[PDB]
Amino acid sequence: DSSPGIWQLDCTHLEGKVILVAVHVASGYIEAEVIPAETGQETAYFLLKLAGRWPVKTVHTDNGSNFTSTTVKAACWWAGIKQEFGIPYNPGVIESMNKELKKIIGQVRDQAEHLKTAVQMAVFIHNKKRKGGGYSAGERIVDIIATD
Numbered sequence: 001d002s003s004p005g006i007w008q009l010d011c012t013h014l015e016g017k018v019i020l021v022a023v024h025v026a027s028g029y030i031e032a033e034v035i036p037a038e039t040g041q042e043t044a045y046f047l048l049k050l051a052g053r054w055p056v057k058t059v060h061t062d063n064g065s066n067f068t069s070t071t072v073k074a075a076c077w078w079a080g081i082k083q084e085f086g087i088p089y090n091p092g093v094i095e096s097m098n099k100e101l102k103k104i105i106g107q108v109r110d111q112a113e114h115l116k117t118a119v120q121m122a123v124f125i126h127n128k129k130r131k132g133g134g135y136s137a138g139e140r141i142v143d144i145i146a147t148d
């Protein structure tokens with residue numbers, strides 16, 4: 001829950017659509033997108049995209065069955081990603097950040113036609129505008145990774 005290579009991926013639902021949320025656990029930085037279907041294929045695609053942008057070493061999820069997809073495992077394999085086992089399940093920080101992201105989405109929803117755009121507005125607010133040495137999550141992730 002503190003190595004700089006750990007990301008957590010989960011799905012949540014809004015307006016009948018699926019939002020995939022990835023959290024960089026050490027910093028609190030978020031990546032999220034609306035995806036057309038809650039599937040292993042979309043999970044795998046997202047992992048490939050994420051790993052090309054950030055150094056992804058291990059991945060966790062609050063729904064372990066997500067990672068039983070052979071397409072997910074192939075994306076893993078190709079990108080050199082392993083599964084994270086040092087984070088126990090809380091039947092939660094990451095769950096709460098997901099709930100906070102949904103709150104931000106609601107606050108900006110009427111400023112965009114499509115949910116996908118509101119989600120990106122909320123990610124921007126979460127990573128860049130929120131501050132909590134009073135840096136943003138975007139500042140924290142780059143500092144953590146650069147130091148590593």
Ligand SMILES: O=C(O)c1sccc1-n1cccc1
Nearest residue numbers: 038039040041065066068069
């Ligand atoms: O998409 C699939 O066909 C399979 S099969 C085993 C797990 C998954 N999955 C679905 C959502 C996230 C992962």
Ligand SMILES: O=C(O)c1sccc1-n1cccc1
Nearest residue numbers: 111112113114115117118121
């Ligand atoms: O208003 C919209 O629905 C779209 S669609 C693509 C970008 C935007 N947007 C949102 C804020 C500023 C621009």
